[PDB]
Amino acid sequence: HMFRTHTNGELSLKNLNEEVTLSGWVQTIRDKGFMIWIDLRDRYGITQLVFDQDRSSAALLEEAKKLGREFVIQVSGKVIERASKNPKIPTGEIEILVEKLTILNNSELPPFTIEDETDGGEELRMKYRYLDIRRNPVKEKLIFRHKIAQKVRNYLSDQGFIEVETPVLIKSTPEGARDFVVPSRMNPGQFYALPQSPQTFKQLLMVGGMDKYFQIVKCFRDEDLRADRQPEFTQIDCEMAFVEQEDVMNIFEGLTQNLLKDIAGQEFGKFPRMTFAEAMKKYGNDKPDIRFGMEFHELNDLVKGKDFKIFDEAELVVGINVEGCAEYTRKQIDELTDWIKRPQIGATGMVWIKYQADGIVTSSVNKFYNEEDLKKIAEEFGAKPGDLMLVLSGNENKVRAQLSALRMELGNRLGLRKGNEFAPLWVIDFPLLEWDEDTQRYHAMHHPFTSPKPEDIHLLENEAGKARANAYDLVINGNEIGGGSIRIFDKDLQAQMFSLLGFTPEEAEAQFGFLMNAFKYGAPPHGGLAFGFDRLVAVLDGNEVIRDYIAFPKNNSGRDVMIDAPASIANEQLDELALTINI
Amino acid sequence: HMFRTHTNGELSLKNLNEEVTLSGWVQTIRDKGFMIWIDLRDRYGITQLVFDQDRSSAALLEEAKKLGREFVIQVSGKVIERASKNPKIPTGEIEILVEKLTILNNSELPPFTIEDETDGGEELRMKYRYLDIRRNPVKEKLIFRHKIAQKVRNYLSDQGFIEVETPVLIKSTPEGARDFVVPSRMNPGQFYALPQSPQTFKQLLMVGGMDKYFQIVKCFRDEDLRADRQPEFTQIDCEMAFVEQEDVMNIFEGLTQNLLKDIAGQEFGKFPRMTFAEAMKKYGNDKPDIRFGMEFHELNDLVKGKDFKIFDEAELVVGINVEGCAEYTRKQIDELTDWIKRPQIGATGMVWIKYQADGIVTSSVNKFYNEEDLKKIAEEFGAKPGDLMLVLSGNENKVRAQLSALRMELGNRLGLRKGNEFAPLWVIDFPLLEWDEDTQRYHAMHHPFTSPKPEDIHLLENEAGKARANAYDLVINGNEIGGGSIRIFDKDLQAQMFSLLGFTPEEAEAQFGFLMNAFKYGAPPHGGLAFGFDRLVAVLDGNEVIRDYIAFPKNNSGRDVMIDAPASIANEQLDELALTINI
């Protein structure tokens, strides 16, 4: 039994009068008098079937009246022309005059409708995730994810990259984020860990002469699952030898351009680059969405010394110009003030300045600033009549994050963040170290093997606080897509970095000795980059929730609600592993 | 700055007189005082460097004399034409007259030679696997594995298969092969399992309408690791909807034809097919190597009834004709008799029949068989003067396995098994069930959801043991490459199969209820196939050892001797997992 001659999305008027066989799911049933119409579905599309006993038989209609939603059926019949074509679907010119029907599975009704806009809540859909996947918004995301993975692997293979599978059962490390562990039966009392990333092995592959490595690979981290955080997640992990920062960025810029061009139909030019300091100062974060304005303007010199204690005592006074919103009401302003006072944000208050359409600049602090003072502030913003400036103050890092949250929240609300617009950029020149004045300590901002920029190595002897890292982050639309760094290959530079970081030679060997010992047999210069694959696909699809790009995700407690994992195992398994559960 | 303008394998006479910069590992040093020659290596090849004393500073030559094997260096110099060309390597027309030298890493000597024929033993090489990977016999296998993976994904994607990542943290089941398990911190006393295969989820993807799914995917099994048995291993896992057995076979035959043509350079025709019964009878196994002869000939009628008790009492007398070996000496025959008497094989003895060069057939049992008796046996084999027939006897299944081992061993010894020769075939028509008298139930030989061939359904009522399965195995050169089966979608047939297998309804629900219940929402017909990827790559490369196609393998006890995993974890980790080691 051939089950089908065609898919349910490929027939058209060119197939008029052909005899065909189709199989699929009953998407919709329509009854008019004695005739029955059915939308037959598979992955490829919908084909309409018509049951008309006058042109078939009374027995066929008897069986067709038994059909329900999501029945799996097979039909044979003749392609005929519809009276009026449905222009919205590829097969909309034709319909199948059914002659034969076989019910393959008399399905129960689905617990929620199999439709783009379904009546099922999220928890019910995850319980029945295998039926959720039938729906176009989920099926299409899995297909799109597949297309990106193939494009990534073909592009990087063409560049000379070799895909290398690295082990999943590796060695557990005490420090850092929690490992998932795997008890060993053959080695009782001992464990493997699941990998946080291929970091150890990808560096060993550079020592091993592989030159250009990549892997699309699952990673595992047993951390708090907050927003869009899965215990297992997918990365594009890459490592290259004999490269400068510029080489790593150009290669992966080319890949990202390749993906964007295919997805958007537009070539993208050279990606803009910002230093860490520029991004923090202008946007209040190190992964900026540069598709819209509301850039930061610091106001200290214009506002201090005028008896407004809040601005006088703050380390930084900084604001944004919200264009066209000078007519915002008191309720709207208070709503924004309440929103930034939420503990999630932590702001203490907000100052507002209206550049009215009649040209008068007024504020919530007119007792301290006259019209000319306010006008100079509007001039600092380049604001125009009709604009609304919002001003926060506080500690430098704290208030930049608060203002950044407010900027992004306003960007969403005002419709300035569009899923079809893409602004990629690199953030570079992160500080290598961060100094604490009280304790006279440096703390590492990156992995201890991260190289200082070559031109900053001379700074390490006496001015280490001014050294930049040879590191780079790729950002799209305010989402961090990936990043990495150039690594140290000079044994003396590495020891000097460990000393600056507060490690004795013996402490450094205790935590990092395996790789350092391997490097002595001929590590080359090398650097790398890893993408968040889940996030990259979501962003390329104009989305910022990664959940539905994962076929079988977990909930916030790490549980698969569809198969009920994790769960208890048998006593004989525990015994054979030499484990007792603390009770 | 820049480490290289070119790789160490791409320069040639076309680059004559260009200034170039190269980096890599010092493969070989030849120092004759007035001139030093260095073979510089990277993944792409070797380029010869010349340090010419009379044309160089004294400092450059002094630095060249500091170089040792596997130093990482960078040089700049001029492409010049070799006086004595090396036709065997791509850069063999040229050499670099070095102007500048930088030691990037003054590597320690490797613990074994970085050469095709190395002086390192296997355990030392695995301890330093990252240095073993530098050698061409290992590097080339990893590159080859990457090439096969790419071809597989491109071929199946073009056929319409969608790659879907399935979870690694899944639910452990008490039955089946032993799971590796993962304790959950967030859900104390509960565990995940690592997947033996994507079995459950690939069926759910058919219920979910994905139609054609595949994955090159890691699998995990905590069973005895004998020879070439890794605790984690890679599969090509595939599943399709609305297919017949023939559909699944044609798709993956096409994939295999594509791979064979690309690697071996010859187009292959339709693959031969044997039933399980035919393979067992002709070759003594269900994964036969058909590239050479020595096919089995059963001899019961020709040997019984001549008062030779051993053959009289034997269930099966069967032999092979070893062409051209009639001059084997008594020591050689005794060696073969001893070899099959080893515990691995378990044979009790061996009879030989020589078709001598003078035309007389003689044997080791002339007391019972005359010249006419021996001649009838030679005719059954189609043996000719110069041939040696070897005959075993015993229980049907045990002696076929013994004779198959002898056949394969002789095939290797005689040079009949060539790595460059490929004979793929399918083995089909396996028995669906096997009867167990001890438990008074049938045993499934494949997945319990495997469907009987349609034409065998009538046998289930009374002769269930004669039913053939809708199942198929792909074999190449005596290696099982993969297999699968068509699944049941009729729940009443499924319930009948559970009864034959000895399950009460309540027991079948306890063990298979999750998929049974999911199928009620519209499982379609579906079938699948999984290949052993490690084995497929090895076989395509003419090898039968899979170890060196795995970048970082484990030893026979499941431990990675390079990083020394598994190992004990911290008491703080055990405590937060509520686990105690049984002392």
Coordinates of N, CA and C in Angstrom, one line a residue, chain A residues 202 206 211 238-244 248 252 472 484-487 524-529:
Chain A
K202 N 38.4 21.8 23.1 CA 38.7 22.6 21.9 C 40.1 23.2 22.0
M206 N 43.6 22.5 19.5 CA 44.5 23.5 18.9 C 46.0 23.0 19.2
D211 N 43.8 23.4 13.8 CA 43.8 24.7 13.1 C 42.4 25.4 13.1
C238 N 33.5 27.3 18.5 CA 34.5 27.4 17.5 C 35.9 27.7 18.1
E239 N 36.9 27.3 17.5 CA 38.3 27.6 17.9 C 39.2 27.6 16.7
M240 N 40.1 28.5 16.7 CA 41.0 28.7 15.5 C 42.4 29.0 16.1
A241 N 43.4 28.6 15.3 CA 44.8 28.7 15.6 C 45.4 29.9 14.8
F242 N 46.5 30.4 15.3 CA 47.3 31.5 14.6 C 46.4 32.6 14.1
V243 N 45.6 33.1 15.0 CA 44.7 34.2 14.6 C 44.9 35.4 15.5
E244 N 44.6 36.6 15.0 CA 44.4 37.8 15.7 C 42.9 38.0 15.9
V248 N 39.3 36.5 13.9 CA 38.2 35.8 14.4 C 36.9 36.6 14.1
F252 N 33.5 35.3 11.6 CA 32.2 35.1 12.1 C 31.3 36.2 11.8
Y472 N 35.7 39.9 22.5 CA 34.7 40.5 21.6 C 33.4 39.8 21.8
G484 N 33.9 35.6 22.5 CA 35.0 34.8 22.8 C 36.2 35.7 22.9
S485 N 37.4 35.1 22.8 CA 38.6 35.9 23.0 C 39.8 35.2 22.4
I486 N 40.9 35.9 22.3 CA 42.2 35.4 22.0 C 42.9 35.0 23.3
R487 N 43.5 33.8 23.3 CA 44.1 33.2 24.4 C 45.6 33.4 24.5
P524 N 49.8 26.4 20.1 CA 50.0 27.6 19.2 C 49.2 28.8 19.8
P525 N 49.4 30.0 19.2 CA 48.4 31.0 19.4 C 47.1 30.5 19.0
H526 N 46.0 30.8 19.7 CA 44.7 30.4 19.3 C 43.7 31.3 20.0
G527 N 42.5 31.4 19.4 CA 41.4 32.1 19.9 C 40.1 31.5 19.4
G528 N 39.0 31.9 20.0 CA 37.7 31.3 19.7 C 36.5 32.2 19.8
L529 N 35.4 31.5 19.7 CA 34.1 32.2 19.7 C 33.0 31.2 19.8

